[PDB]
Amino acid sequence: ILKDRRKQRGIRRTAQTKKKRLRELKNYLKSIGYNESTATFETVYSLAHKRGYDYADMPEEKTSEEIEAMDVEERKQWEKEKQEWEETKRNSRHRKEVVKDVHKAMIEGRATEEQIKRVERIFNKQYRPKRFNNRILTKCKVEDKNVRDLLIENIVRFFPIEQSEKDNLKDAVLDKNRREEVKSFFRKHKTDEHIRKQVYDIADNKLSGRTVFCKEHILSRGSALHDRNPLSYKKGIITRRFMVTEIECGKEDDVISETYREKLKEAFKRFDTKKGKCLTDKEAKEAGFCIKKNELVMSLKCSIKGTGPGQMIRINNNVFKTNVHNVRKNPRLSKHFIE
RNA sequence: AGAUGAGACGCGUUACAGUUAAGGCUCUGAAAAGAGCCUUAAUUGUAAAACGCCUAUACAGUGAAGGGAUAUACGCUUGGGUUUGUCCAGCCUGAGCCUCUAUGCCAGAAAUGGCGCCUUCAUCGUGGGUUAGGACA
């Protein structure tokens, strides 16, 4: 399964793009004349980390009659999109706000309007171009959404009625005004319910125009090295910080902080707990815990068990858990081991 | 009835540094208390998140000029980097080309124009691509 590979790819490329734009903003603000120790630079640079989300303002707008229409998978995916939008907007700002703090900071530093527009360009510049439209190349190009009229021609051609009302049905379905007329003939002649969902799927132009033939005949130890999340390794004790929700009920004794361990124990005692499985977020939130500003549940340092210094490698500041362990040490990771 | 692919916004982890709150230790002081160190949590700032391989004939920015459907490329053909002991997928890209495919944004009923986009020159720098997926050894 390559879905986790795609997720890691996206995180990697997003971090690289953020590196590129921070480097360009750093270079341009140095080229203006004020490098450091001037409060315009710290303000604008700290704004640049959290630049905002104007590109997808109100993403995937949809009406409730459409929410009642699609399949279970698509409506669960749309609920995921709605939850993603709600979760980001509590921590994301729209970019026109971030532009406003950039303007405030740069006006406070008596800069020119051309410099403000140039910083605006650096903030809005797209580095890796959105190249998405023609990506999947499932081909029968060797003969052995842009196909709308051909597709309804394939659907309607099996109806017993004569060709002229087939053309009128085609003209009714390609035009968005005449949908009630399609319901009129669709009540008039009783076909399968698969025919309604299919025909009104071309009427709503989902991704079905690419799964198609050529137009003339429409008629372990392999790749991964180590764990994703860095661990903390200081003076011989190995720990990693966990959120309270993420701590499983069977692992409460592993928390290094004693007082929060007792509070988690009486949290499991006060509320109904499931023995040894992961505990819920809002279920944990009602008990006595300090709240965070942004994500709204605290974090507690936890001890990692079962592994030790025999696998730990150090790439820059981070310390990871090696997945392959001994290959005799692995030659690719042989230079980064701790001992 | 299901799967490959692009671009960000965010969250989370780690390192360093600062601040606040709570706790512990030491010194000083007649005492109130003052100072310093350590632990936990919250908050802020900067940085890292494959190892590596390839690329300076490259990559990126700015300005000017020209083109922009008689056109470009996420396309085709043929090569290359990732690439190894060998072969792929995916991504990125050189040359030719418009045969298939794809062709964004804004104003305008439209014609059309302006942005995005492509090429050249000058200037400024060092930057860019791919790496968590497989199969045979």
Pairing of strands A318-321, A312-315: antiparallel
Interhelix angle A3-32/A113-124, rounded to 10 degrees, is 170
Query: What is the distance between the alpha carbons of residues A74 and A170, in angstroms, rounded to a whole number?
Result: 27
> Do A59 and A85 meet the contact criterion of CB atoms below 8 Å apart?
yes
Query: What is the distance between the alpha carbons of residues A249 and A276, in angstroms, rounded to a whole number?
Result: 5
Q: Could you identify the residue written with the tokens 């994703």? A: A228
Q: Which of residues 75-104 of A touch strand B (CB under 7 A)?
A: 87-88, 91-93
Query: What resolution in angstroms, rounded to 1 decimal?
Result: 3.4
> Do A169 and A223 meet the contact criterion of CB atoms below 8 Å apart?
no
Strands of A90-225, DSSP E: none
- Helix, strand, coil percentages, rounded to 5, for chain A: 45, 10, 45
Q: How far is CA A85 from CA A56, A95, A206, in A?
A: 10, 15, 22
Q: Which residues are A231's β-sheet partners?
A: A319
How is residue A270 annotated by DSSP?
H
> Do A253 and A260 meet the contact criterion of CB atoms below 8 Å apart?
no
- Nucleotide with minimal C1' distance from the CA of A291 is B42
Query: What is the distance between the alpha carbons of residues A245 and A122, in angstroms, rounded to a whole number?
Result: 38
Domain parsing of chain A, residue ranges = 3-124, 148-217, 232-305
Sign of the alpha-carbon torsion through A298, A301, A307, A309:
positive
Nucleotides, chain B, CB distance < 7 Å = 1-16, 40-52, 60-62, 73-76, 90-92, 100-103, 117, 125, 127-135
Strands of chain A, DSSP E: 232-234, 237-243, 299-303, 312-315, 318-321
